């Protein structure tokens, strides 16, 4: 059949070296299948080492391999299935459905690798997404076609933040979305599967307005790496060939970096800083560049990033930090303050915010908020030791507003009926600008601090003031 037949020579982890026969060069980045009593082990060809001996990375677990096993060649990068047939049905890295909602329903395939869209292809967005999440809406508006980036620490409900985004934004937007999970727990997986069945986004009968690619961290590091490529190609089929404007979601992209770092060592490369792959920049670059809004479709990626020990100075977060468009920083501390959303308001920044883009009023309002908060933080040290007393009357009004603004940001989420147990609230962007404007004007500086805490809009704050009064 495929004359490309190889005999294993060395199984040493993910590295499996094969000794293909004369004249058989399975090109770099091809996909090899080795028939095994476990199924077909997929090896992605990653080097030619000479005399028809390749060095390949495994994409499925290694065990039982016998030196000499016949190796067929698919002949090209892993060919996934694409279609609207991929909607619904969870798809594992190789492509096989692991929720087993029938066989591969797709009629088309595409390779995992692809060449990033050219400079010419790029189309500059300016449409402004509305998330309904107030901190986002005023202080770092997201853009429809954006590359939103959820830098944050583990266990802040990194997933929870994303779940809220899917909960609001995904259903709201008509277009398909692809939920791609890179190296996440099957606990999280089951929750996500259940949750989007619950929100009905996954429609078991009838088309789902989403496709799912759950890649979990129980898969070898190599397999973890090419979960990203797989998800991306599905998105590309939607973006390009169906022309749909999609909103990509990937989770957690530090796992993508981490995965690459692990197989770097195995590939025998000189380990770089904090053990990261030397190819860190270009590998990130290929992934990130592939994800973009073109003159074809518009992709709105939301990428979770895990910042190890909350040090953004760690090169891997910093590299991603450059490649993204609309950063969001989620302060663990602020989560602990009980403020949910847990966003770090000063550090969250989106280039999208501009007096032209969101209008002069929005800009001015947001400048005033930022200044108020920045002052509050600056004064926080003074209040700490000296004690607030000799800080001006003006300062006291600013501080009073800041403590209030700090808790006006707080606003429950429906998917944190699980957590907080408070039904969600999502307020229109235009309305949020108005409501925050009111706070700054100080018309509600007679309202108690706790009557701003964990509630929606200004109307709600007023209602909770009345409620607390009673």
């Amino acid at each position: 059949s495929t004359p490309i037949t190889g005999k294993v020579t060395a199984v040493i982890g993910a590295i499996v070296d094969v000794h293909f026969e004369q004249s058989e060069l399975p090109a770099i980045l091809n996909a090899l299948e080795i028939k095994t009593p476990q199924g077909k082990l997929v090896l992605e060809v990653a080097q030619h080492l000479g005399e028809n001996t390749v060095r390949t990375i495994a994409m499925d677990g290694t065990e039982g391999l016998v030196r000499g096993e016949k190796v067929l060649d698919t002949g090209g990068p892993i060919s996934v299935p694409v279609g609207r047939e991929t909607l619904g049905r969870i798809i594992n890295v190789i492509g096989e459905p692991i929720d087993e909602r029938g066989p591969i329903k797709s009629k088309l395939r595409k390779p995992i690798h692809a060449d990033p869209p050219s400079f010419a292809e790029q189309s500059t967005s300016a449409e402004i997404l509305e998330t309904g999440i107030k901190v986002v809406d005023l202080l770092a508006p997201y853009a429809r076609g954006g590359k939103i980036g959820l830098f944050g620490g583990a266990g802040v409900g990194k997933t929870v933040f994303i779940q809220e985004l899917i909960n609001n934004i995904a259903k709201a937007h008509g277009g398909f979305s692809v939920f791609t999970g890179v190296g996440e727990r099957t606990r999280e997986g089951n929750d996500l599967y259940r949750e989007m069945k619950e929100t009905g986004v996954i429609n078991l009968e009838g088309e789902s307005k989403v496709a799912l690619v759950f890649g979990q961290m129980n898969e070898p590091p190599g397999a973890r790496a090419r979960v990203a490529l797989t998800g991306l190609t599905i998105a590309e089929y939607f973006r390009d060939e169906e022309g749909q404007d999609v909103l990509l979601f990937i989770d957690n992209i530090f796992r993508f970096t981490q995965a690459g770092s692990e197989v770097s060592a195995l590939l025998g490369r000189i380990p770089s800083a904090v053990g990261y792959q030397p190819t860190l920049a270009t590998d990130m670059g290929l992934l990130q560049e592939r994800i973009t809004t073109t003159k074809k479709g518009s992709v709105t990626s939301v990428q979770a990033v895990y910042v190890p020990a909350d040090d953004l100075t760690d090169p891997a977060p910093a590299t991603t930090f450059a490649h993204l468009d609309a950063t969001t920083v989620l302060s663990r501390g602020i989560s602990e303050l009980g403020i949910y959303p847990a966003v770090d308001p000063l550090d969250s920044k989106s280039r999208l915010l501009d007096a032209a883009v969101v209008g002069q009023e929005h800009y001015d309002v947001a400048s005033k908020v930022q200044e108020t908060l920045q002052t509050y933080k600056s004064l926080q040290d003074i209040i700490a030791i000296l004690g607030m007393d000799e800080l001006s009357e003006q300062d006291k009004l600013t501080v009073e507003r800041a403590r209030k603004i700090q808790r006006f940001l707080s606003q429950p989420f429906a998917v944190a009926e699980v957590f907080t147990g408070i039904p969600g609230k999502l307020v229109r962007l235009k309305d949020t600008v108005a409501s925050f404007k009111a706070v700054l004007e100080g018309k509600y500086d007679n309202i108690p601090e706790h009557a701003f805490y964990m509630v929606g809009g200004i109307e709600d704050v007023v209602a909770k003031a009345e409620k607390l009064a009673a």
């Binding site: 000189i270 380990p271 770089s272 800083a273 053990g275």
Partner: protein, 53 residues
Amino acid sequence: QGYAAEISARRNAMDNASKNAGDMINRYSILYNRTRQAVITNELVDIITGASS
């Protein structure tokens, strides 16, 4: 008489504070410098070990 002594005491105390704080700056500065050097060296050693293989 008391108030003058109070404000005077506050001046004296805050002055002595500046001195005490300065000493702590110096102690942590030496620690900082030592720590900074040590990190560079230890990381470098790991990189070298990897290259050596």
